Swiss-Prot record:
Forms a cylinder of 14 subunits composed of two heptameric rings stacked back-to-back. Interacts with the co-chaperonin GroES. Can form asymmetrical complexes, composed of one GroEL and one GroES, and symmetrical complexes, formed between one GroEL and two GroES oligomers. The asymmetrical complex is the functional unit. It was suggested that the symmetric heterooligomer may represent a transient intermediate in the chaperonin protein folding cycle. This is Chaperonin GroEL. It is found in: Cytoplasm. The modification N6-succinyllysine is found at K94, K138. It comes from the Bacteria. The gene is groEL. Belongs to the chaperonin (HSP60) family. Transmembrane segments: none annotated. Each subunit is composed of an apical domain that binds non-folded proteins and GroES, an intermediate domain and an equatorial domain that binds ATP and is involved in inter-ring interactions. Forms a large central channel that appears to traverse the entire length of the cylinder with no obstruction. The central channel of GroEL functions as two cavities, one in each ring, that are separated from each other by the crystallographically disordered 23-amino-acid C-terminal segments of the seven subunits. The entry and exit of polypeptide seem to be restricted to the apical end of each ring. Together with its co-chaperonin GroES, plays an essential role in assisting protein folding. The GroEL-GroES system forms a nano-cage that allows encapsulation of the non-native substrate proteins and provides a physical environment optimized to promote and accelerate protein folding, probably by preventing aggregation and by entropically destabilizing folding intermediates. Also plays a role in coupling between replication of the F plasmid and cell division of the cell. The chain holds residues 182 to 376 of 548 of the full protein. It comes from Escherichia coli (strain K12). Coiled coil: none annotated. Phosphorylated reversibly during heat shock.
Amino acid sequence: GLVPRGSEGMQFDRGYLSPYFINKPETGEVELESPFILLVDKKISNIRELLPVLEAVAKAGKPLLIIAEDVEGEALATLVVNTMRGIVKVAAVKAPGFGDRRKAMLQDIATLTGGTVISEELGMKLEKATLEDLGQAKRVVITKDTTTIIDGVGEEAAIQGRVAQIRQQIEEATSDYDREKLQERVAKLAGGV
């Protein structure tokens, strides 16, 4: 059936990784305005790797959303301290899904926001990540259970290309379940443009 609205935003069921990112206390949400978006395949644990991007984000003065397999240990704690001190306005959530679908959905976000996924295979290293690898969106709302990416800034053509590519996979799928999961990615991409 027809969705009778416009762009609600790309929503995924992964919430804030710490309650100290709660920006809006009355609702228990995180609300970042025009944030940079960091996309990482692996988990972020060591603080030695997040520093480089974090200080560059801190210097720029814009909020930051980190989407990684998981964000833990001292990396999480460093984000907590710096956010409480007001040095950086940062929120961190887990990449949605797992396995190859996690990887695929991460790339969907990257394409949508014009960011670059830091993967170990392609020669990248989180420490070497820069501001140009970061994606952007008009607003990110993070609840206990969900993350919503409103109006990614990615190239129209690339987003369209990603939607077509998914459509190629839906026609090549073997079951209703596989088709509906791929269809879900298409809905997510359409929601956040």
